[PDB]
Design an enzyme around this catalytic site. Structure first.
Site, PDB file in Angstrom:
ATOM      1  N   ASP A  44       0.838  -1.193   0.000  1.00  0.00           N
ATOM      2  CA  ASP A  44       0.000   0.000   0.000  1.00  0.00           C
ATOM      3  C   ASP A  44       0.876   1.247   0.000  1.00  0.00           C
ATOM      4  O   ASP A  44       1.694   1.437   0.917  1.00  0.00           O
ATOM      5  CB  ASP A  44      -0.926   0.031   1.211  1.00  0.00           C
ATOM      6  CG  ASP A  44      -1.843   1.230   1.179  1.00  0.00           C
ATOM      7  OD1 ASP A  44      -2.816   1.187   0.401  1.00  0.00           O
ATOM      8  OD2 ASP A  44      -1.566   2.235   1.886  1.00  0.00           O
ATOM      9  N   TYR A  49       2.902  10.156   0.700  1.00  0.00           N
ATOM     10  CA  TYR A  49       3.843   9.573   1.670  1.00  0.00           C
ATOM     11  C   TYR A  49       5.300   9.946   1.370  1.00  0.00           C
ATOM     12  O   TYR A  49       6.178   9.742   2.213  1.00  0.00           O
ATOM     13  CB  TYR A  49       3.697   8.045   1.780  1.00  0.00           C
ATOM     14  CG  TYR A  49       2.317   7.560   2.193  1.00  0.00           C
ATOM     15  CD1 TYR A  49       1.384   8.417   2.776  1.00  0.00           C
ATOM     16  CD2 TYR A  49       1.943   6.235   1.993  1.00  0.00           C
ATOM     17  CE1 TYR A  49       0.118   7.973   3.121  1.00  0.00           C
ATOM     18  CE2 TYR A  49       0.682   5.782   2.351  1.00  0.00           C
ATOM     19  CZ  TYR A  49      -0.227   6.655   2.907  1.00  0.00           C
ATOM     20  OH  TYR A  49      -1.479   6.187   3.231  1.00  0.00           O
ATOM     21  N   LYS A  78      -2.617   6.061  -4.375  1.00  0.00           N
ATOM     22  CA  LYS A  78      -3.729   6.950  -4.064  1.00  0.00           C
ATOM     23  C   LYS A  78      -3.473   8.335  -4.635  1.00  0.00           C
ATOM     24  O   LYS A  78      -2.347   8.848  -4.584  1.00  0.00           O
ATOM     25  CB  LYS A  78      -3.940   7.056  -2.546  1.00  0.00           C
ATOM     26  CG  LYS A  78      -3.829   5.730  -1.800  1.00  0.00           C
ATOM     27  CD  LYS A  78      -4.219   5.838  -0.334  1.00  0.00           C
ATOM     28  CE  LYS A  78      -3.856   4.574   0.438  1.00  0.00           C
ATOM     29  NZ  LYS A  78      -2.398   4.502   0.770  1.00  0.00           N
ATOM     30  N   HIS A 111      -7.723   9.340  -2.407  1.00  0.00           N
ATOM     31  CA  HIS A 111      -7.157   9.213  -1.062  1.00  0.00           C
ATOM     32  C   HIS A 111      -8.102   9.725   0.028  1.00  0.00           C
ATOM     33  O   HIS A 111      -8.257   9.084   1.077  1.00  0.00           O
ATOM     34  CB  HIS A 111      -5.806   9.935  -1.011  1.00  0.00           C
ATOM     35  CG  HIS A 111      -4.890   9.460   0.071  1.00  0.00           C
ATOM     36  ND1 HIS A 111      -3.517   9.504  -0.052  1.00  0.00           N
ATOM     37  CD2 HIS A 111      -5.145   8.963   1.304  1.00  0.00           C
ATOM     38  CE1 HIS A 111      -2.968   9.043   1.058  1.00  0.00           C
ATOM     39  NE2 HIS A 111      -3.933   8.708   1.897  1.00  0.00           N
TER      40      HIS A 111
HETATM   41  N1  LIG Z   1      -5.948   5.760   3.267  1.00  0.00           N
HETATM   42  C1  LIG Z   1      -5.526   6.506   4.312  1.00  0.00           C
HETATM   43  O1  LIG Z   1      -5.948   7.633   4.552  1.00  0.00           O
HETATM   44  C2  LIG Z   1      -4.536   5.894   5.263  1.00  0.00           C
HETATM   45  C3  LIG Z   1      -4.348   6.441   6.535  1.00  0.00           C
HETATM   46  C4  LIG Z   1      -3.470   5.835   7.436  1.00  0.00           C
HETATM   47  C5  LIG Z   1      -2.788   4.695   7.036  1.00  0.00           C
HETATM   48  N2  LIG Z   1      -2.957   4.195   5.783  1.00  0.00           N
HETATM   49  C6  LIG Z   1      -2.190   2.966   5.308  1.00  0.00           C
HETATM   50  O2  LIG Z   1      -2.253   1.950   6.318  1.00  0.00           O
HETATM   51  C7  LIG Z   1      -0.920   1.603   6.728  1.00  0.00           C
HETATM   52  C8  LIG Z   1      -0.943   1.124   8.191  1.00  0.00           C
HETATM   53  O3  LIG Z   1      -1.349   2.170   9.074  1.00  0.00           O
HETATM   54  P1  LIG Z   1      -0.350   3.013   9.962  1.00  0.00           P
HETATM   55  O4  LIG Z   1       0.955   3.196   9.265  1.00  0.00           O
HETATM   56  O5  LIG Z   1      -1.063   4.270  10.311  1.00  0.00           O
HETATM   57  O6  LIG Z   1      -0.145   2.243  11.364  1.00  0.00           O
HETATM   58  P2  LIG Z   1      -0.136   0.696  11.841  1.00  0.00           P
HETATM   59  O7  LIG Z   1       0.155  -0.298  10.675  1.00  0.00           O
HETATM   60  O8  LIG Z   1      -1.369   0.470  12.646  1.00  0.00           O
HETATM   61  O9  LIG Z   1       1.090   0.730  12.855  1.00  0.00           O
HETATM   62  C9  LIG Z   1       2.409   1.043  12.390  1.00  0.00           C
HETATM   63  C10 LIG Z   1       3.276   1.090  13.658  1.00  0.00           C
HETATM   64  O10 LIG Z   1       3.273  -0.173  14.353  1.00  0.00           O
HETATM   65  C11 LIG Z   1       4.599  -0.667  14.540  1.00  0.00           C
HETATM   66  N3  LIG Z   1       4.566  -2.107  14.363  1.00  0.00           N
HETATM   67  C12 LIG Z   1       4.378  -2.793  13.250  1.00  0.00           C
HETATM   68  N4  LIG Z   1       4.376  -4.055  13.462  1.00  0.00           N
HETATM   69  C13 LIG Z   1       4.554  -4.256  14.785  1.00  0.00           C
HETATM   70  C14 LIG Z   1       4.645  -5.410  15.566  1.00  0.00           C
HETATM   71  N5  LIG Z   1       4.548  -6.652  15.052  1.00  0.00           N
HETATM   72  N6  LIG Z   1       4.844  -5.215  16.888  1.00  0.00           N
HETATM   73  C15 LIG Z   1       4.940  -3.983  17.431  1.00  0.00           C
HETATM   74  N7  LIG Z   1       4.857  -2.854  16.700  1.00  0.00           N
HETATM   75  C16 LIG Z   1       4.672  -3.000  15.373  1.00  0.00           C
HETATM   76  C17 LIG Z   1       5.433   0.049  13.461  1.00  0.00           C
HETATM   77  O11 LIG Z   1       6.793   0.172  13.890  1.00  0.00           O
HETATM   78  P3  LIG Z   1       8.060  -0.045  12.939  1.00  0.00           P
HETATM   79  O12 LIG Z   1       7.667   0.413  11.487  1.00  0.00           O
HETATM   80  O13 LIG Z   1       9.121   0.802  13.551  1.00  0.00           O
HETATM   81  O14 LIG Z   1       8.442  -1.574  12.981  1.00  0.00           O
HETATM   82  C18 LIG Z   1       4.756   1.431  13.434  1.00  0.00           C
HETATM   83  O15 LIG Z   1       5.192   2.266  14.502  1.00  0.00           O
HETATM   84  C19 LIG Z   1      -0.145   2.919   6.484  1.00  0.00           C
HETATM   85  O16 LIG Z   1       1.275   2.712   6.522  1.00  0.00           O
HETATM   86  C20 LIG Z   1      -0.683   3.257   5.094  1.00  0.00           C
HETATM   87  O17 LIG Z   1      -0.090   2.410   4.112  1.00  0.00           O
HETATM   88  C21 LIG Z   1      -3.816   4.755   4.914  1.00  0.00           C
HETATM   89  N1  LIG Z   2      -4.146  12.519   6.691  1.00  0.00           N
HETATM   90  C1  LIG Z   2      -3.054  13.286   6.892  1.00  0.00           C
HETATM   91  O1  LIG Z   2      -3.122  14.318   7.545  1.00  0.00           O
HETATM   92  C2  LIG Z   2      -1.761  12.873   6.225  1.00  0.00           C
HETATM   93  C3  LIG Z   2      -0.978  13.851   5.608  1.00  0.00           C
HETATM   94  C4  LIG Z   2       0.198  13.503   4.957  1.00  0.00           C
HETATM   95  C5  LIG Z   2       0.588  12.163   4.921  1.00  0.00           C
HETATM   96  F1  LIG Z   2       1.712  11.828   4.301  1.00  0.00           F
HETATM   97  C6  LIG Z   2      -0.186  11.171   5.530  1.00  0.00           C
HETATM   98  C7  LIG Z   2      -1.366  11.532   6.176  1.00  0.00           C
HETATM   99  O2  LIG Z   2      -2.163  10.602   6.832  1.00  0.00           O
HETATM  100  C8  LIG Z   2      -2.217   9.276   6.302  1.00  0.00           C
HETATM  101  C9  LIG Z   2      -3.022   9.309   5.046  1.00  0.00           C
HETATM  102  O3  LIG Z   2      -3.726  10.257   4.735  1.00  0.00           O
HETATM  103  O4  LIG Z   2      -2.896   8.200   4.331  1.00  0.00           O
END
Ligand SMILES: NC(=O)c1ccc[n+]([C@@H]2O[C@H](COP(=O)([O-])OP(=O)(O)OC[C@H]3O[C@@H](n4cnc5c(N)ncnc54)[C@H](OP(=O)(O)O)[C@@H]3O)[C@@H](O)[C@H]2O)c1
Ligand SMILES: NC(=O)c1ccc(F)cc1OCC(=O)O
Length: 316
Positions: A44, A49, A78, A111
């Site tokens: 994803d 990002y 996105k 997005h």
């Molecule tokens: N469409 C949108 O608006 C939107 C918004 C938010 C997120 N997203 C997508 O969803 C993805 C996931 O969400 P997120 O990045 O917000 O947070 P998340 O996946 O809920 O959590 C990421 C965090 O958890 C830690 N972590 C991962 N695996 C772990 C494990 N097995 N044990 C302990 N800690 C662990 C990571 O640390 P380390 O990386 O340091 O290992 C990082 O600090 C995003 O990266 C993005 O691709 C999309």
């Molecule tokens: N939603 C936000 O404010 C945001 C802004 C910049 C960025 F790189 C990430 C973000 O949140 C996660 C998202 O929107 O996927």
């Protein structure tokens, strides 16, 4: 538990993917390489990002190394809010393709439903600090997304952070050509999303759960905030199954017929997060996890609450 879910475009989407928001550019190339090496087939991504080039380096190396074939990968990106204008959508997609070093995306999402003024800034502000909106109707943005399918740039299109009324707007679009394949939304035990999920699934739209671990590295975290990974109730369920709390948090949406995209740049955790196809949560476990809902959001887009299309005023 099958590894992929069938989309309404006829393609299959891996139910586990690697998230890349906040993955530092100097670490994300190795993260994606490791992910592919340990079995991930879905990444994803997003232009906003700021790390798509580095994600792309990893994808390209693994393709070149013949670790995986392109047809076996499912790459998602996105369209950022500043590219909702119909004449900017194709260029935004093409920039993402160029950075990712791909000739198509498997899925391209709007997005957020909120369009912003186009320009270099991802959050263009007026002098008083409000985000400056775009007058482009989201239905027109959708038509531009449909053109990407018809030009071969993307295999599927979808939406993200759309509330049920906004999803309904797309579904009711005059002359709708392609239904959204996916709505990607925040979902975890503190934001369980029953209403929005059932609505989407009933319309044949697959839901992807983001921030499944509660995004402990989110930039606006406060020390007093709830913490899924530290919730002793969730730890207890994990201990019962001899798994980690993260593994329970990832398995949870899988058993709701959702796709889930945990983010990590830590090789051990990337591997851990994928080892979730060897146990099953009971119905009781599932309902217990659902009971922890508190309507708590990692991503509330707080700077845009005054935007006309802000998604989170509605109940769902
Ligand atoms: N469409 C949108 O608006 C939107 C918004 C938010 C997120 N997203 C997508 O969803 C993805 C996931 O969400 P997120 O990045 O917000 O947070 P998340 O996946 O809920 O959590 C990421 C965090 O958890 C830690 N972590 C991962 N695996 C772990 C494990 N097995 N044990 C302990 N800690 C662990 C990571 O640390 P380390 O990386 O340091 O290992 C990082 O600090 C995003 O990266 C993005 O691709 C999309
Ligand atoms: N939603 C936000 O404010 C945001 C802004 C910049 C960025 F790189 C990430 C973000 O949140 C996660 C998202 O929107 O996927």
């Amino acid at each position: 538990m099958a590894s992929r879910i069938l989309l309404n475009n006829g393609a299959k989407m891996p139910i586990l993917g690697l998230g890349t928001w906040k993955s530092p550019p100097g670490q994300v190339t190795e993260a994606v390489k490791v992910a592919i090496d340990v079995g991930y087939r879905h990444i994803d991504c997003a232009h906003v990002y700021q790390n798509e080039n580095e994600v792309g380096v990893a994808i390209q190396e693994k393709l070149r190394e013949q670790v995986v074939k392109r047809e076996e990968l499912f790459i998602v990106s996105k369209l950022w809010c500043t590219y909702h204008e119909k004449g900017l959508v194709k260029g935004a997609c093409q920039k993402t393709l160029s950075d990712l070093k791909l000739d198509y995306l498997d899925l391209y999402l709007i997005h957020w439903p909120t369009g912003f003024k186009p320009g270099k800034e991802f959050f263009p502000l007026d002098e008083s600090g409000n985000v400056v909106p775009s007058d482009t109707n989201i239905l027109d943005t959708w038509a531009a997304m449909e053109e990407l399918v018809d030009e071969g740039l993307v295999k599927a299109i979808g939406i993200s952070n759309f509330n049920h009324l906004q999803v309904e707007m797309i579904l009711n679009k005059p002359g709708l050509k392609y239904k959204p394949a996916v709505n990607q939304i925040e979902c975890h035990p503190y934001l369980t999303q029953e209403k929005l999920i059932q609505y989407c699934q009933s319309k044949g739209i697959v839901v992807t759960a983001y921030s499944p671990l509660g995004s402990p590295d989110r930039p606006w975290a406060k020390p007093e905030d709830p913490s899924l990974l530290e919730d002793p109730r969730i730890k207890a369920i994990a201990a019962k199954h001899n798994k980690t709390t993260a593994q329970v948090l990832i398995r949870f949406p899988m058993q709701r017929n959702l796709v889930v995209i945990p983010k990590s740049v830590t090789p051990e955790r990337i591997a851990e997060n994928f080892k979730v196809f060897d146990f099953e949560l009971s119905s009781q476990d599932m309902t217990t996890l659902l009971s922890y809902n508190r309507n708590w959001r990692v991503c509330a887009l707080l700077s845009c609450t005054s935007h006309k299309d802000y998604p989170f005023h509605e109940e769902f």
